Write an enzyme that holds these catalytic residues in place. Sequence first.
Site, mmCIF file in Angstrom:
data_model
loop_
_atom_site.group_PDB
_atom_site.id
_atom_site.type_symbol
_atom_site.label_atom_id
_atom_site.label_comp_id
_atom_site.label_asym_id
_atom_site.label_seq_id
_atom_site.Cartn_x
_atom_site.Cartn_y
_atom_site.Cartn_z
ATOM 1 N N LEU A 17 -16.128 -15.275 0.963
ATOM 2 C CA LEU A 17 -17.421 -16.000 1.061
ATOM 3 C C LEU A 17 -18.552 -15.004 1.190
ATOM 4 C CD1 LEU A 17 -16.512 -19.042 3.591
ATOM 5 C CD2 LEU A 17 -16.845 -19.303 1.153
ATOM 6 N N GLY A 18 -18.311 -13.898 1.882
ATOM 7 C CA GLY A 18 -19.382 -12.888 2.005
ATOM 8 C C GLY A 18 -18.765 -11.649 2.532
ATOM 9 N N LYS A 19 -19.464 -10.524 2.356
ATOM 10 C CA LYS A 19 -19.102 -9.247 2.942
ATOM 11 C C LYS A 19 -20.337 -8.510 3.412
ATOM 12 C CE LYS A 19 -15.056 -6.482 1.925
ATOM 13 N NZ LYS A 19 -13.837 -6.337 1.066
ATOM 14 N N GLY A 20 -20.255 -7.904 4.581
ATOM 15 C CA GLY A 20 -21.381 -7.230 5.185
ATOM 16 C C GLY A 20 -20.845 -5.845 5.377
ATOM 17 N N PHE A 22 -19.615 -4.282 8.162
ATOM 18 C CA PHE A 22 -18.366 -4.054 8.904
ATOM 19 C C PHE A 22 -17.380 -5.219 8.831
ATOM 20 C CE2 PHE A 22 -22.101 -3.951 11.815
ATOM 21 C CZ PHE A 22 -22.619 -2.697 11.494
ATOM 22 N N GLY A 23 -17.791 -6.352 8.275
ATOM 23 C CA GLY A 23 -16.990 -7.592 8.335
ATOM 24 C C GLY A 23 -16.989 -8.386 7.035
ATOM 25 N N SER A 24 -16.072 -9.353 6.898
ATOM 26 C CA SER A 24 -16.162 -10.348 5.810
ATOM 27 C C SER A 24 -15.853 -11.712 6.315
ATOM 28 C CB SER A 24 -15.214 -10.062 4.610
ATOM 29 O OG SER A 24 -13.864 -10.054 5.040
ATOM 30 N N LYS A 44 -14.125 -15.086 10.000
ATOM 31 C CA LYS A 44 -14.692 -13.754 10.019
ATOM 32 C C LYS A 44 -13.747 -12.696 10.577
ATOM 33 C CE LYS A 44 -18.692 -10.993 11.272
ATOM 34 N NZ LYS A 44 -20.135 -10.912 11.729
ATOM 35 N N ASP A 138 -31.261 -9.810 13.483
ATOM 36 C CA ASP A 138 -30.911 -9.840 12.019
ATOM 37 C C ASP A 138 -31.314 -11.218 11.440
ATOM 38 O OD1 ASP A 138 -29.702 -8.663 9.698
ATOM 39 O OD2 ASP A 138 -27.525 -9.102 10.373
#
EC number: 2.7.10.2
Length: 293
Positions: A17-20, A22-24, A44, A138
């Site tokens: 669904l998403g990736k940042g 340090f995390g997904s 997450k 953020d």
Amino acid sequence: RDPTQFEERHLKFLQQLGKGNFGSVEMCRYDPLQDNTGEVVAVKKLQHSTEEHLRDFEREIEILKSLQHDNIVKYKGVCYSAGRRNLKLIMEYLPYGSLRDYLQKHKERIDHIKLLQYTSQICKGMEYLGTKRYIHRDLATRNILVENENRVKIGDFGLTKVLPQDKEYYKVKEPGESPIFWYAPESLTESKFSVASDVWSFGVVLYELFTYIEKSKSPPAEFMRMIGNDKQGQMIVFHLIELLKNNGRLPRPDGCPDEIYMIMTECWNNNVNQRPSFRDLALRVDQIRDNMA
Ligand SMILES: NC(=O)c1cc(-c2ccnc(N)n2)[nH]c1-c1cc(C(F)(F)F)ccc1Cl
């Protein structure tokens, strides 16, 4: 059995669904009957689940678990791995995805009254977060999720800090991720974060909404244009600090109502104390919506 305890082996990957940094976040079906009928949830996890990162992530999870509000994504539970104790955070799946994606997709098919409904809802999630002495750090449309066409929620708390008991700011000594184009001047110069610096970022969210996430108009595009596209690495931060100190600001978005633009620029005050409160922003926004309706 306890529904906030999820067994890892029953979580079936459906899609990313998403990736940042340090995390997904993955969409998974929690399917202990193994017949594809289980609940779909958002999960997450860390890409590098180092000791230091896991400690921060477990705090992030306690932060989310403590928040119960219509405009804050719902914590469902956690998955624990044997041994090294990797952690996964289980949350409700909000099926229209990030507000950034959603608005980029529908553009001006979403009208001002709907944008102001979202703005009011974001304001209220933030006001509630501030009652717990949490600083989000953020606040950006990429961190806001859309449940349905009438409800959005703050959807990620990865940079969130808890204020010390005796102070109204948190100083980050060795920043990792820093979304500098959303940062208040004192966050750039001194790494100080507060409810007032979240308010500065909310002004940037309001700018995002009203530009309909047009890429050529995003906060990074516009600030890079104002400092000059030749600036790079740490020099961007230097020139951005000088620009903000001189009252350089994002432009009024094309078509933006005056009263909305007034609120953005008041959020972008250099004087921390002159920025409005989220309580007042939510009152003001709802008055605007009322006037419009
Ligand atoms: N980046 C995205 O597009 C997305 C989508 C979701 C999502 C979609 C549906 N339900 C829920 N709970 N989250 N959540 C995210 C997301 C992911 C991340 C990260 F960096 F951790 F991976 C951070 C912030 C968000 Cl909103």
